[PDB]
Amino acid sequence: TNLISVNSRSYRLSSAPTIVICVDGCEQEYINQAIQAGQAPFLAELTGFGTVLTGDCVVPSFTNPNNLSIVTGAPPSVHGICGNFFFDEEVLMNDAKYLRAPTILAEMAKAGQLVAVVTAKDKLRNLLGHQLKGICFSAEKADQVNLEEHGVENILARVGMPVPSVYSADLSEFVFAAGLSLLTNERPDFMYLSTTDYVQHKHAPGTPEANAFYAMMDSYFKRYHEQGAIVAITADHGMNAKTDAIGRPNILFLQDLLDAQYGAQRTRVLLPITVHHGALGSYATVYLRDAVPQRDAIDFLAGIAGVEAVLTRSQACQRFELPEDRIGDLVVLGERLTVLGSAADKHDLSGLTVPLRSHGGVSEQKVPLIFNRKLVGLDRLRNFDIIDLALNHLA
Amino acid sequence: TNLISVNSRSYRLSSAPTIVICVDGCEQEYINQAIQAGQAPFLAELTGFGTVLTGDCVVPSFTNPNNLSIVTGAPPSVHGICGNFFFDQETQEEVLMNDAKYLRAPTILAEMAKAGQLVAVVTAKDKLRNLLGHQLKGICFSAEKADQVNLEEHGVENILARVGMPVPSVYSADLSEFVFAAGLSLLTNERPDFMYLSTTDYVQHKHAPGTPEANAFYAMMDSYFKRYHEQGAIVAITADHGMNAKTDAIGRPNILFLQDLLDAQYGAQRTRVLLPITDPYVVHHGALGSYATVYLRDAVPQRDAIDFLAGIAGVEAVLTRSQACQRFELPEDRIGDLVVLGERLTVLGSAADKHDLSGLTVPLRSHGGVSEQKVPLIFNRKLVGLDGRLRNFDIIDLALNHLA
Ligand SMILES: [Zn+2]
Ligand SMILES: [Zn+2]
Ligand SMILES: [Zn+2]
Ligand SMILES: [Zn+2]
Predict the structure, then answer these.
(1) Considering every ligand atom, which ligand is closest to the CA of A277?
(2) What is the CATH number of the domain that holds B286?
(3) CB contact burial A14-37 (16+ within 10 A = b; e otherwise)
(4) Structurally, how many domains does chain A consist of?
(5) How many CB pairs under 8 A join A and B?
């Protein structure tokens, strides 16, 4: 068909309705466990006609950076969204204003395709819908969709569900339910769906709660498939326990530690995230005031138990492909079971109602890539290559 | 209060029966999930009176090397057992470390007995019991052969009758349950000063944390932990290594065939791949772990092999003997020219041709690498004098000397 070029990648416009799903916080085990548990029959047999792969997401393994990467088919060094915020002013990249590249989404639309985007959280929806002319809304604000703004109307009635609670599993279901109704009505050419990792943050793979959620998604996949759509599924990042044997969190307050070593006001620990984790992840940035010597800082931090790696700006930028201008002097990586906080005084841990499970580091990098089709031309796979494979590598 | 010193460590003899338990493959998450699920009420309330900590086991995160360090309070560099076997480039043969004849240090257990202490050791597997019973005068037997138990050798008689159970199958949870049960008998009867209990990771290789079956097994242990505690014993719990999934989203295994790989790069026989996770002869899935060692022929340029291997997706790290020894504290004479570590979700095999994966009913769960290094340290008592990097092999020190 018609071929569009976006961010230096060429894409062949879909002939059949294509659905790219981003399963927030999808550590592979979730899937393996549900199947074993017999709670995902569809995925269980998908191997008969499908393709299951494993790819690497973007580091820092956070939702925004990853989602943006998926829809642009590029890394943060291209789209420029490497976290929820940066420094210089503690500015927030919550606006497309911060977007430095186009989405594949907007291009398909410009080429005349009917593109749809559905996300659980409204905030994402903003970033993703940049320059998009089509259907675009969140489950979070389903109640207020209008034709002009969102390309749709009365989705609540259509879906047969009330506005869900942000801190509910219902938020994600809504996403799937909405995607079904659009498929069977409007029949978009391309649809992008994105959930929240609310469940994954609260439950580990293999638990009733987790299995149940997966059982729900599996049903939707089945139905999408039954509709003749092409279904492509991935995740933005993985997920892990960040606790001891009894559920107590393994935290390292970098700000506190740094302040003690070099004296307060001398360093600036930034946590590119913001209840799921109480802003606790395995990745952080550090800004050094002239007073402190990078060499020293590295040695110091690196020797702290729980730190996985200390990278300089250049190191990180090149290794992870990030924008040098929106990253600190140092990049700190947390170990498998460790999260990094700023200062103790600045965190509300009393909100943690269950043992902490988070992401951000390298141990939440492995993510799945699943198709309900067979593929061709397979040569280091990234989660943001999903669209590529879905539009160009079909057998 | 008697003081002894072993392997350069001082230890105060127990005043109360102390029981040190090694829960094989006890990834921390198993405890967390069992508690969250209502299946571990005793452990669930232990914080209020006990102590929960985290340590690093020895890498390779294997069963024998670890258990051995626990009982000697030292690394393999000291006791010598750094795997199931090794390769002697003097004899050009495969050397099986299945005999206490390979031990380079004394066990703390043996010493406590020398000092007049009544010391019991109960393992699930009999093979372990042999290494552990080195120079030990006390009670020592395995559930696996709780059959052939005589007074002269084991220090006990008719344990089956005592426990009220039959001899359990190796490939089962009962195997481990027996251990506990037998430990309860001894405690209530012989009441040893010191006891060491060691299970098998059968269940953990099969079920993930939070699974009905995982939780069940955990609920069983909790029950004994409580009984021991109600008897007044000091209960200290750790693990030999954690456990992880070694598959993809659908449960297919992540396997690297290092022999195959190397052979294709260097040709047949220029390298030798050893998987010390078990005895050299085993070819089943039981032989796949996230650590392997490699012997290079003189012809093969070491740096090159490092680069080659280091470049294969799924290999976390490749280290030379020297680096490996220093870093993990291993005996240089019993490891290969190279040490290969695999990523979190990856295992290392030798040659496809060799392995028999027919036995893998369920998706692969294994260990041996840095991703299975974190382990718990649990005590039913408050502790004091805590000074850097806790090891599982510091358990005895803590349990004997750090009691509050
Ligand atoms: Zn996410
Ligand atoms: Zn999250
Ligand atoms: Zn073990
Ligand atoms: Zn094992």
Answers:
(1) 2
(2) 3.30.1360.110
(3) beebbbbbbbbbbbbbbbbbbbbb
(4) 2
(5) 93
